[PDB]
Amino acid sequence: HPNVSAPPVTIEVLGSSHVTNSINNELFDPLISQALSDIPAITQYNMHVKKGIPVEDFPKTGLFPEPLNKNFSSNISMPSMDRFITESAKLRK
Amino acid sequence: KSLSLIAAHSHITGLGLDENLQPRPTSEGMVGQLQARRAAGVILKMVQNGTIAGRAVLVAGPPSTGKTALAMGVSQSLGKDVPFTAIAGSEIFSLELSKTEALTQAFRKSIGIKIKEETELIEGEVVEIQIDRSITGGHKQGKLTIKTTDMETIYELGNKMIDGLTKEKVLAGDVISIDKASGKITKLGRSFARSRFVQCPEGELQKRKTVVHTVSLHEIDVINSRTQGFLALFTGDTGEIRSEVRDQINTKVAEWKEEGKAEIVPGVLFIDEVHMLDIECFSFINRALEDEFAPIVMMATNRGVSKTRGTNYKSPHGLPLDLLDRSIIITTKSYNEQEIKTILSIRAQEEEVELSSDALDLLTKTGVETSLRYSSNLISVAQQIAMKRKNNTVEVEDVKRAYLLFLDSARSVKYVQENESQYIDDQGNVQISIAK
Amino acid sequence: SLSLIAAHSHITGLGLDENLQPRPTSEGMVGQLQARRAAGVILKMVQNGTIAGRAVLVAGPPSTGKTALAMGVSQSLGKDVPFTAIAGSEIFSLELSKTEALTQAFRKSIGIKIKEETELIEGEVVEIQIDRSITGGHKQGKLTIKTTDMETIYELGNKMIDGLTKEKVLAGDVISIDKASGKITKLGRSFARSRDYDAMGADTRFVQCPEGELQKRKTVVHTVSLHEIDVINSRTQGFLALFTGDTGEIRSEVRDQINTKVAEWKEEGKAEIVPGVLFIDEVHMLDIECFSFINRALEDEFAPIVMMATNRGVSKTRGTNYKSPHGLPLDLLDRSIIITTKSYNEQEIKTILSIRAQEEEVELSSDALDLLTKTGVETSLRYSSNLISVAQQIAMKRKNNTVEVEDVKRAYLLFLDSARSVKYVQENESQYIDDQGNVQISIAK
Amino acid sequence: VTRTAAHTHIKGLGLDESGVAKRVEGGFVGQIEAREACGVIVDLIKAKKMSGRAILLAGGPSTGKTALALAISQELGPKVPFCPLVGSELYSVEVKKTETLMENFRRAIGLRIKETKEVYEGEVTELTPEDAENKTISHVIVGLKSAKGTKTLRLDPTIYESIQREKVSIGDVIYIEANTGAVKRVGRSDAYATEFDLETEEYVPLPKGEVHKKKEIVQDVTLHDLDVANARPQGGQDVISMMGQLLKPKKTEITEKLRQEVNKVVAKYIDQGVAELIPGVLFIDEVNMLDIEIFTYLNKALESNIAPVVVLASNRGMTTVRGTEDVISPHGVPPDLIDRLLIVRTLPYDKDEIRTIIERRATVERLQVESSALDLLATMGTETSLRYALQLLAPCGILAQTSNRKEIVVNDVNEAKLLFLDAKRSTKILETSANYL
Amino acid sequence: VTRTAAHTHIKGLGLDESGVAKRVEGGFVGQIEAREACGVIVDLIKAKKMSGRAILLAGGPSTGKTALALAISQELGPKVPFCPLVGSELYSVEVKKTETLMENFRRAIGLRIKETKEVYEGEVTELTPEDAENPLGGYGKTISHVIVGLKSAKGTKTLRLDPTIYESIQREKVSIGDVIYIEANTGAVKRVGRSDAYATEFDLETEEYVPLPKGEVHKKKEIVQDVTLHDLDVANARPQGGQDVISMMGQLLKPKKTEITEKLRQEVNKVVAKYIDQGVAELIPGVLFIDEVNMLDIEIFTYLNKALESNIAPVVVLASNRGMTTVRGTEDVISPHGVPPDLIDRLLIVRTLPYDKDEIRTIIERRATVERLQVESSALDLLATMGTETSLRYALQLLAPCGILAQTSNRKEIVVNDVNEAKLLFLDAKRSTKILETSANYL
Amino acid sequence: PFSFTTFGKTTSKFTDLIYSSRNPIKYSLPRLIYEDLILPNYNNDVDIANKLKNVKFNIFN
Ligand SMILES: Nc1ncnc2c1ncn2[C@@H]1O[C@H](COP(=O)(O)OP(=O)(O)O)[C@@H](O)[C@H]1O
Ligand SMILES: Nc1ncnc2c1ncn2[C@@H]1O[C@H](COP(=O)(O)OP(=O)(O)O)[C@@H](O)[C@H]1O
Ligand SMILES: Nc1ncnc2c1ncn2[C@@H]1O[C@H](COP(=O)(O)OP(=O)(O)O)[C@@H](O)[C@H]1O
Ligand SMILES: Nc1ncnc2c1ncn2[C@@H]1O[C@H](COP(=O)(O)OP(=O)(O)O)[C@@H](O)[C@H]1O
């Protein structure tokens, strides 16, 4: 896992809401954010059946690449109870 | 302050000069080199005047004579918000940038644009926050009671203030700052509530704050290049910025100076070991010094009548004569016993090394026979030897032990030449066997 | 309209007869009768189109007209025939190897002619009435396309409606639809429906409403080079690499598949191979690897006729350490035929100078033409050709229309040739930077 | 207070209406023959007829080749394109050197396009979108208002899409360009500044002028600008992106097909009278740094129909050409290229015009120099070099100013000569000393 | 049992409390003055005060320079960052060599930070999104908020997530009944796995089953983290960890070294100095070791001259076998140890002497005991004579074939016949060169 | 990993969680550069030149 995880460098411009709007539209662009994610299934049922939106006019989703495992999905590692036994040779024996 | 351990030029706080540009014998961590320091003060006044553009100076001399010390003194006496770009000669041989493009970036990192602007800020200590939620949540209302040491007020918040205060969670007792136009809330910290800790700010909320920005021309070149974001200012993958962007930036900067909305701050581009550039970089420097938006270039070299890189002939200082025609040369000289002793005493005083007078005399004799840098390196290891014996003062025997344990250049050369069979020579021959 | 008067703009082709015999002065080409006859033989072989991969080396001293002969061949070749004129220095690149750059230069010089028939309905849209189907399949539409003269109603299918909703066409938009293939375009908005909106959009283009017949028949002849097909089939969206140039070392199997498909499209008759000429100017500036790849690449049936130009004598081949005639190895000269260009006498210099002065609209006097001819015989053709225009500007600064002897003498005094500059440098060698870098900027000692 | 560069004092070639160079005019003194030759060259450029003409300025160092090149640049004017370049700049690590040379060739051919700029500025009073389905909006009625009155506009759904992109509501001062279609939200008006006591809205004033403002502008582009405009491996130059794209675009070898298509489009626009073609100057200082391959491609590219006027500078003599081994050629330029050049010889100076150069540089930098100090500076310029005196002019002024004098005295010149060394004295110190100076 | 290498037998410098060196301790034999100088350097590093101090280990081949560098690294401990390097490793095809040298300079400087993490951990009980009223506007997303219920041990609370945090949730494929772990510092979500409150014998995806997390939801936990300055530089140069689309697409791009600018390094230094001034992090300077420093060319030495003068540069130790050798990348610059005199003036040369017969004998004995081999005294004496005759490394590397030949003949001891057979089977460099000189068809 | 972040942290019916991570490194840009070189303005020409280079002189028009 990496040692340091960092967001991009935030650019601040004092006294301008246009900079904040453009930065929020760039970092959180809804097309790219929707492409790297998925709509919830009950939400898809609500747009398709309840709201009558065809599936061809849905936003494109599910384009994020799959990881190797569930272990490779995130960099956070939980303290394993089975590891705790083998951390001490006295306790393992 | 920032991150600073004790370095080679930490004791130099600038140029020890008077109001008449006369160098004191010992001032601001610099001793000796009176003509070199006066010439550096003249160059510093050329930078501080700001009316002279594209002057190349060459600091030339023997090694360990203070060329980089002179450049550090100029940089320390320059002050803040004046761009000092110090690079080595090998830094511009890049794999993703051409050498002329890297030289252009180094040239334009040393010219700044000074813009002053006003911002309305609300910096205060939060008394309380109330927010009354709706039945469903379509509309949110709230009151923010804030105070300072002088004032105390209540604000009727809108929806966007409520969303920007719930995000970046502000409780009672927090000193915060709000920019009203950009909608940015910065938590300066917890106030003096006993229950980090920052004092309650002074009164007159919603104050005008004047911010003075110095932005280098390279940053505006990266910004105006629409294929380059400003993250390339940190990642470094600017990747050969086109010339037309630089022409638009030059015309915009000239019209900003004419309109009075901005000022131009010239700076210093220092090139340590300038002999390591090749001849095409020297030609590019020869043409690029003629620009109006060009800084003053200090170059340091120690080579004497050396072969110019990229060519097959030899030139003085490793530099061709068309470059030396465009430059005025500052010559640094060697040090005598007293200047070496004063430099060693200053270096010992900086590193909190208490040493005796005869130890200082022995270190001065070593730095006269061998080199100033060898004795200045020997000071710290002699101090470590001194505290190994639980002694707080460096004696003569500590310097003798440090001289015995760590060798200089001439002793290493002599010990290699006496036992040249044990080392690997130019032909790759070595006798690793010790017998027969 | 954009082209200015260049160094070879006066040449409209080889000045030959129907018997391949060169005229003394025709189509801007003067002299070089053996070279022009040989180049006419070369042109016929390209026009025959039945043999492939001949290497022709145009050799001679500089300023004799090797590149002039190549431009004469290219002008006599006519349009829609691939002529690729490249220099030898363009092969050395950074993301393409030398053999790959040579392959792209070879396959850019041979193409295929393809005939297309278009039934174009071009007009402004008045109304699109959509018959909304209950099941949604086969959505019928009524297109009211309209010219200046007359207007019909067209029936529209479901994929037609999907194409007309993929791009945003409304009433008052000028579109043309192909009947045979169903191609869709949007030329923009008509000028009659242009004043209805106070501000135009980002992609809004204003075009004139077409007149005449609503549906027109047209036959379009497309000349597509083999390199174009390689770049198209190399990538998913390969047409951008045809213009940006980042093709990036197209693999071999694409090229064999495209060659076999070109052969079968030829044998079923929907395309015909048009060979052309690849002209490498200054071919001595190539590596020995490039020469070996040229030697093997000339033996393919999809290979153009290669004309190479060299002004070198017995010079060192690049990439090796030995000298060779023309700067070319002996196995390359083995698979080649050499056209030799000779120097010009006084009459040919005078005729070429008069033609170049007539091309630049400069009225030369007879004594000025004689002085320029004497300078051309003494120094060089190109020096007098460059002197003509600056003498014209000198005479125009003197409020004169034609040039005289004094204008040519002033241009000779102001601008130096090679020999005079060599003499001035050799007389004062301390003032210039030597090969060892030494110079004397100081004027006194 | 304006800064002073090395070529600030030169404003032109200093010629009269007959082309004869006045001796001291336009920041020049002496060098009359090369100035007259450069005047003939700029007359040839102003004729706007020739293509691929090449002139080489050959002379010693500190003689005024670059001075004559910038004098040509001021004589032509800012309308004519001028591309200054070094021979070292063609060696790029992203694209090949012939492509860089051809890009700099296309950078020196410009276009003037007359255009209109029409701007609607002010606060939105009404924003009513009319749908008229055939879900999809037909148009939008937008009412802008400034201090001189209000104005109503009908806008297409593309501008409505751009308006809803900017989060424009009722009461926001916005900016609309009628020709481009760009929508920029300036911010909320102060008439709605007291709806809440604290909110993230930026409250800007109402525009004092009219809502609709129209003016005439001229666009000065180059052929290289139009080349790189439609040759992008990753497109999207239209969208405003402060942050960079995820994949860095690299310089690529632009094919001749794009050049011919751009030329066809430009010729079609010129034939309509919209655009005007301005041939310009590509100046290459230190042309001896060019590789022999770049010289060969220069030989090929000087015969193009759209090539500009190329001005080369060199200070070498009988020198080996770069990239070769035994080609001794004048000025480091191979003899095949030299046959296509016109050579302008640049002469050295003597004491009197060196003195006038020194006094002109002193007058431009606003320094008062005494007459005997000027004579000492001229003698030092004849002894060491001219640029040594020209670069020691400003330390003399600083040493005079630190002694509270506005006049440079002889003692200031002696002090500046003592503090700063020329090349010859430093070479003598280098030769006499042993341990690396 | 244990796998051994060339420097396994060395546990440290092996000095007294006064800095003097015992002759045979710490896995070291001889080199008393070199070990004492290395101990003085180790104390200088432990002072944590100086910057850019540089020494040079000079000596012949097989004299123990890398042994002394490993002893310095072992005596400093695992907390002090030690960066071993070869002079050939700085030549990278992705980025310039000076950037690689600066990256290793920042890699040798360490930082120990206490970090407070705000954590929402627990088992997902309900996960219901609230849909947007206009899903196809193109400006928002299909949902507005997501209500998620989490229960820990003795605690239950519900969270209203914005669509970014829910996107981070659903990219971990979080369903009902999953114990999860949301880190509020970055928005990163860890799916711990299925809760053991339900049946755990009916899954097919080899999942782990975890209990409910102890304590309340929304904890604040303190973690001690050891990073380097290069880690911060490469994290800020290539941003990953945020939930914005730039961080997420930069996760998926191919990693590539870039020329990290001085502006980013100065900003990282400012943030680290702010962390120190709040008393939450401490700076641990370390060692950059460059073995075979002769492989560097003149440009890396020139950049080293500038980089050693920085106020953040680590302690740099170098090794070289060369004598009076020309510097790489130059033509006529003859210099000691292949290091130019501009860098030699900034150095402190530590000499290393060759060994005697008895020192070689006890080095062979210690290498035999660390490899679990039994050698007879006569065979040990023959190994010592072979080491003095051919080379020390040839005598050390012949011990394992001797053990193989001993265990082949069902013996635990190494007899003289075994070392004679290993001498016959395997050749040193001198005998191989003598075969090369007396052969025809280029052996 | 060590989170190089500044975010909304509690100093100490539902409680909402909003993504609020920011880099500690802040780049300050003046309003003049953004409003005169990037944004369209009446005295600027970025929209006109952008339409001229991207639409009017596009070779795929
Ligand atoms: N005049 C001086 N005053 C104070 N310190 C000096 C002086 N000259 C040199 N030094 C110190 O000596 C050390 C080596 O000098 P340096 O600047 O490296 O000279 P050079 O760059 O010419 O080799 C530096 O750490 C510098 O601080
Ligand atoms: N036969 C010819 N007829 C007309 N012009 C010629 C002829 N030969 C040469 N020229 C002129 O001489 C100039 C230089 O000739 P060029 O084609 O460059 O010869 P080379 O390629 O051998 O150097 C050209 O600009 C061309 O106009
Ligand atoms: N004839 C002249 N009159 C006035 N100033 C001159 C003249 N010639 C040269 N200079 C000045 O001398 C300086 C150096 O000359 P420059 O053109 O750089 O030499 P080079 O031709 O070697 O490039 C320039 O700043 C220029 O202003
Ligand atoms: N003083 C010593 N005591 C014990 N073993 C040593 C000693 N010096 C060297 N060695 C051994 O000799 C071998 C060669 O040492 P090394 O430092 O790798 O070579 P070099 O000195 O040429 O860099 C190492 O495996 C090491 O274990």
Tell how far the Cα of E64 is from the centroid of ligand 4, in angstroms: 4
Query: How far is it, in rounded angstroms, from Cα E37 to Cα E19?
Result: 9
Question: Token pair of B407, please?
Answer: 């060798």
d(CA E207, CA E197) in angstroms, rounded, equals: 14
Which position has the token pair 């053999």? C99
Q: Which residue of chain E has the CA closest to D248?
A: E253
Residues with CB under 6 A from ligand 1: B 8-9, 12, 29-33, 61, 63-69, 343, 372-373
Cβ of residue A8 closer than 8 Å to a chain F Cβ: yes
Q: Is the pair C, B in contact (3+ CB pairs within 8 Å)?
A: yes
Tokens of C43: 């042109």
**Torsion-angle region of residue D281: left (phi > 0), alpha (psi -120 to 50) or beta?**
beta
Distances (CA, A) of E68 to B320, B407, E59: 45, 17, 12
How many angstroms from the chain centroid is the CA of residue E256? Answer: 20
- What is the gyration radius of the CA atoms in chain F, in angstroms? 21
Q: Helices then strands (H, E): number in chain F?
A: 2, 3
Which technique was the structure solved with, according to the deposited record? cryo-EM
* Four-residue CA torsion sign, C189, C195, C196, C201: positive
Q: Is D67 in the pocket of ligand 3 (CB under 6 A)?
A: yes
Instruction: Write phi, then psi, for E35 (nearest 5 degrees).
Output: -70, -35
CA C282-D224-B113 angle, to 5 degrees, is 125
Contact criterion met (CB below 8 Å) for B279 and B310: yes
How many CB atoms are located within 10 Å of the residue E433 CB? 11
Reduced 3-state DSSP string for C173-235:
EEEEEECCCCCECCCEEECCCCCCCCECCCCCCEECCCCCCCEEEEEEEEEEEHHHHHHHHHC
How far is Cα B105 from Cα B112, in angstroms, rounded to an integer? 13
| CA–CA gap between residue E404 and residue E412 (Å, rounded) | 10
D61 lines ligand 3 (CB under 6 A): yes
Q: Residue B313's closest chain C neighbor by CA?
A: C436
Confirm or reject contact between D370 and chain A (CB < 8 A). no
Beta strand spans in D106-180 (E): 109-130, 139-146, 149-155, 172-177
d(C-alpha D178, C-alpha D425), whole Å: 67
Contacts of C418 (CB under 8 A, 6+ apart): C379, C380, C383, D330, D335, D338, D339, D343
Instruction: Report the distance separating Cα E354 and Cα B433, nearest Å.
Output: 10
Best residue in F18, F19, F21 for a mutation probing chain A (most A CBs within 10 Å): F21
How many Å apart are CA B168 and CA B183, to the nearest integer? 12
Resolution to one decimal, Å:
2.5
For C212, counting Cβ atoms within 10 Å of its Cβ (0-12 exposed, 13-18 middle, 19+ buried), the class is exposed
Evaluate whether C87 touches D98 at the Cβ level (below 8 Å): yes
Q: Are strands C336-340 and C55-59 parallel, antiparallel or unpaired?
A: parallel
Instruction: Please choose, from the candidates E99, E330, D286, the residue with its C-alpha nearest in 3D space to the C-alpha of residue B93.
Output: E99
Query: Which residue matches tokens 């109503």?
Result: D152
Q: What's the rounded Cα separation, in Å, for the pair C167 and C169?
A: 6
Longest dimension (CA), chain E: 93
Rounded to the nearest angstrom, the minimum Cα separation between D246 and chain E is: 7
Contacts of residue E71, Cβ cutoff 8 Å, sequence gap at least 6: E10, E12, E13, E14, E26, E27, E28, E35, E38
Any bridge partners for residue E86, and if so which? E291
Question: Using a CB cutoff of 8 Å and minimum separation of 24, what contacts does C21-27 make?
Answer: C25/C351, C25/C355, C27/C72, C27/C75, C27/C76
* Residue C161 half-sphere exposure toward CB, CA atoms < 13 A: 18
Nearest residue (by CA) to ligand 1, atom 7, is B66
- Dist CA E64 CA E350 (whole Å): 12
Round to the nearest angstrom and report the end-to-end CA distance of chain E. 39
Within 10 angstroms of residue E424's Cβ, the number of other Cβ atoms is 8
Cα torsion at C70, C73, C74, C79 (round to 10°)?
180
What burial class does residue D1 get, using C-beta atoms within 10 Å of its C-beta: 0-12 exposed, 13-18 middle, 19+ buried?
Answer: exposed
Q: Does A61 touch chain D (CB under 8 A)?
A: no
Q: What is the DSSP string of E66-108?
A: HHHHHHHHHHH-SSS-EEEEEGGGG--SSS-HHHHHHHHHHHT
D149-155 and D212-222: which strand pairing?
Answer: unpaired
Task: Give me Rg for the CA atoms of chain D.
Answer: 30
Q: How far is B55 from B39, CA to CA, in rounded Å?
A: 14
Q: Whose CA is nearest to atom 16 of ligand 2?
A: C65
List of residues 6+ apart from D363 with CB closer than 8 A: none
How far apart, in Å, are the Cα atoms of D225 and each of B244, C213, D104, D378?
9, 40, 11, 47
- Cα distances (angstroms) measured from residue E199 to each of C114, E95, E109, E177, E195: 70, 54, 50, 11, 9
Query: Rounded to 5, what percent of chain E is helix, strand, coil?
Result: 35, 25, 35
DSSP classification of residue F54: I
- What tokens appear for D54 in the block? 């090449």
Which residue among A2, A9, A75 places its CB closest to the CB of F23? A9
With 0-12 CB in 10 A as exposed, 13-18 as middle and 19+ as buried, what is A29? middle
- The backbone torsions φ and ψ at residue C24, rounded to the nearest 5 degrees and listed phi first, read -60, -35
Neighbours of B128 (CB within 10 A): 13
- Which of these, B383, B390, B385, lies nearest to B360 by C-alpha position? B383
Q: Which ligand is nearest to the CA of E23?
A: 4
Q: How far apart are CA B302 and CA B72, in angstroms?
A: 17
User: Which of E143, E171, E247 lies nearest to residue A40, judging by beta carbons?
Assistant: E143
Question: What number of residues does chain D have?
Answer: 437
- Please state the three-class secondary structure of A51-66 as a single string: CCCCHHHCCCCCCCCC
Is B62 assigned a ligand-binding role in the annotation?
yes
D399 at interface of C, judged by CB pairs closer than 8 A: no
Q: Phi/psi of residue B35, each to 5°?
A: -70, -40
Angle at D427 between CA D421 and CA D430, to 5 degrees: 105
Nearest residue to E177 via CA among E166, E191, E189: E191
- DSSP string over D190-255: GGGTTSSSB-S--EEPPPSS-SEEEEEEEEEEEHHHHHHHS--SS---SS--SSPPSS--------
The encoded tokens of residue E116 equal: 């407070």
Using the beta-carbon criterion (under 8 Å), do A75 and F35 form an inter-chain contact? no
Rounded distance, CA C43 to CA C109, Å? Answer: 14
**Sign of the CA dihedral with C1 first, then C5, C7, and C10 last:** positive
Question: What tokens appear for E187 in the block?
Answer: 């928005």
Q: Are B59 and B71 in contact (CB under 8 A)?
A: yes
CA atoms of D9 and D71, how far apart (whole Å): 10
Rounded to whole angstroms, the Cα distance separating B376 from B364 reads: 10
Q: Which helix (H) or strand (E) holds D7?
A: none
Q: Write the Ramachandran bin of B300: left for phi over 0, alpha for psi from -120 to 50, otherwise beta.
A: beta
Cα C367 from Cα C389, distance rounded (Å) = 16
B73 touches B14 (CB < 8 A): yes
Q: Is E438 labelled a binding residue?
A: no
Q: How far is CA D119 from CA B376, B432, C359, D206, D422, in A?
A: 69, 85, 48, 15, 59
- Phi, psi at B139, each rounded to 5°: -130, 140
Q: Which two tokens stand for residue E25?
A: 């301790």
> Of C19, C412, C89, nearest to C280 (Cα)?
C89
- Pairwise CB contact (< 8 Å): E44 & B384: yes
The tokens for E358 are 């008895």
Cα–Cα distances in angstroms (integers) from residue D102 to residues B180, B246, C154, D105, in the given order: 51, 19, 51, 5
Closest CA to C193 of C215, C177, C169, C213: C169
The C-alpha atoms of residue C116 and residue C183 are separated, in whole angstroms, by 13
F51–C205 CB contact, under 8 Å: no
Backbone angles phi, psi at D54, to 5 degrees: -135, 130
Ligand 4 centroid to E392 CA: how many Å?
Answer: 9
Selected residues 244-263 of chain D with any CB under 8 Å from a CB in chain E = 246-247
CB C241 within 8 A of CB D228: no
Report chain F residues whose CB lies below 8 A from the CB of D175. Answer: 40-41
- CB nearest to B433's CB, from E19, E98, E391: E391
Does residue B182 contact residue F26 with C-beta atoms inside 8 Å? no
Going by C-alpha positions, the residue among C48, C106, C98 that lies closest to residue C77 is: C48
D24-25 and D28-29 beta bridge pairing = antiparallel
- Residue-wise DSSP of E201-222: SS-SS---EE-PPSS-SSEEEE
For A93, the token pair is 């024996």
Q: Which amino acid is at C257?
A: Q
Strand, helix or coil for residue E333: coil
Residue A38 near chain D (CB below 8 Å): no
d(CA C281, CA C291): 14
* Phi-psi label, residue A62: left if phi above 0, alpha if psi -120 to 50, beta otherwise: left
Burial group, residue C325, by CB count within 10 angstroms (0-12, 13-18, 19+)? middle
E301 and E343 in contact (C-beta within 8 Å)? Answer: yes
Residue D139 near residue D155 (C-beta atoms within 8 A): yes
Pick from C79, C17, C96, C6: nearest CA to C386: C6
Short-list D282, D278, D280, CA closest to D298 = D282
Q: Which of D44, D266, D331 sits opposite C389 (nearest CB)?
A: D44
- Amino acid present at E165: I
Angle between helices E377-389 and E357-370 (to 10 degrees): 120
φ/ψ of D297, rounded to 5, equals -70, -30
Torsion over CA: E261, E264, E266, E272 (sign): negative
Tell me the C-alpha distance between C404 and C394, whole Å. 10
Q: Do A8 and E239 touch (CB under 8 A)?
A: yes
